Structures are given as C-alpha cells and as structure tokens.
Curated annotation (Swiss-Prot), chains A, B:
It comes from the Eukaryota. N-terminal acetylation by NatA is important for transcriptional silencing activity. It comes from Saccharomyces cerevisiae (strain ATCC 204508 / S288c). Homodimer and interacts with SIR4 and RAP1 C-terminus. Interacts with MCM10. The proteins SIR1 through SIR4 are required for transcriptional repression of the silent mating type loci, HML and HMR. The proteins SIR2 through SIR4 repress mulitple loci by modulating chromatin structure. Involves the compaction of chromatin fiber into a more condensed form. It is found in: Nucleus. The gene is SIR3. Present with 1400 molecules/cell in log phase SD medium. This is Regulatory protein SIR3.
Length: 127, 127
C-alpha cells in the first residue's frame, strides 16, 4: 500500500523519468531540472546500463537490430508530456517554469520514497 | 539478406504498424488506410493478442500494473510520425492524402514480403 510499492506498480517510461530525475538532482538539492536535461539524462542511463531489464525492454519497442543504442531523437519520439502530466497527477512531480522563456522544468517530490522504490525495482538492476 | 529478414531486423513499433496494415488491408486490395484507423487497429491487435511477445513488451514500457489493456490515448503517445517516415524510408509504405482535407493515409507496398516476415516473427506468435 506504500508510495514506493505504488511506483513499482507504474509504467517503465514513468519509472525511467522518475528514477533519472532522482539520480540527476541527488546532491546539491533544488530538485528542479529542465525537461530537456531529464531527457538527455534518460538516454545516458539507458545506454550506460545495457544490463537493466528496463533498458533492454525499451530498446525492443523503439529500436531495430541495426540500432546499437537509444538516441535522444529515438527517445524524444515518446510523449514526455503524458508522463509529466501522469507524474504530477500522482503528486510525485511538479512542473516549474524557467525565468525568462516559459521553458518546462520539473521538480521531484520526496526522493527518499522514490529511491526506496528504485532500490527494490527488479527491472532497474543488472546481472 | 531478404526484404522479410530486414523487417524482422526492425523495431517492434514499426513491425506492429506494418503487420496491422497488412492485416487490415488484406482482402479487397487498395492497400490504403487512414493513419487514425491503423492506430485504432493496432490497439485491437495488441488487446486481442495478450499472448504475443510484442503485446506483452509494449505494455511493460507504456503501461502500469493498474492498467489492464492499451488504449488509443496510451498508444497515441508514441510518434507515429517517425515510424511512418522510417517505413517510407525503407520503401515499405507510401503516404497518400485524403481527397478534401489533407488527412494522412498510408499505402502498403508488397504485402507478401511483409506477411512472409509476419509468419516467421517470434515476437508476433502466442503460446
């Protein structure tokens, strides 16, 4: 019934965004990152962790045999709009606006409840 | 080196669009269908074939545990633009325009080379 058990009970796309955001903001707090940056950082997580079931499963749906690794252009193809809207719906994320130009930025809520879910996720581990 | 072997060596998203189009136009020829219709027909193929590895794998990336079957709204989230552009690139599809309003329609080229690939695809079979 926990927050962390409910995250496991979510989609892979949602979890890869959420886990990347928790991993990219962990350090000097703030917990806010540009949506573009979260996308470049998901690519890095996927390509740097071929061993992950998440990485292997995403690749089978959006990539062919000829393709050796996910690119931003191949990933950008997904509706990051819908995941962002679904995550704000679960009260796990907040959309913040960039100071001069209305650029989308995203704020992680309760990283410890997310990281407790990352730690117990079987699709986010390597051999 | 065959056309059919090169289709297997493609992405799941591309194959589900291609195989659905081959399945939906098989009959009274023409081989042209509205892009919207191809999308509603992919949903039906996925939900009517839970046994397919393709169906099971797509579901893990775009759907959570709470979600029992893929909807048009959950599927529409993908860039059907990119698959359509990649398939025209492989000379396997042609984009045709709807007579009054510039509505996207899609024309299947060589269905027998596609169906020969559908018949030998291990991700498009059930238990």
């Amino acid at each position: 019934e926990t927050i962390s058990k409910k995250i496991i009970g979510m989609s892979l796309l949602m979890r890869t965004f959420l886990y990347t955001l928790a991993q990219e903001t962990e350090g000097t707090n703030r917990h806010t990152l540009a949506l573009e940056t979260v996308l470049i950082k998901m690519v890095k997580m996927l390509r740097d962790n071929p061993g992950y079931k998440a990485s292997k499963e995403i690749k089978k749906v959006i990539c062919g045999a000829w393709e050796p690794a996910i690119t931003i252009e191949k990933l950008k193809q997904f509706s990051w709009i819908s995941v962002v809207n679904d995550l704000v719906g679960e009260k796990l994320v907040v959309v913040v606006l960039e100071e001069p130009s209305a650029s989308i930025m995203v704020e992680l809520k309760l990283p410890l409840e997310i990281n407790y879910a990352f730690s117990m996720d079987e699709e986010f581990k390597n051999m």
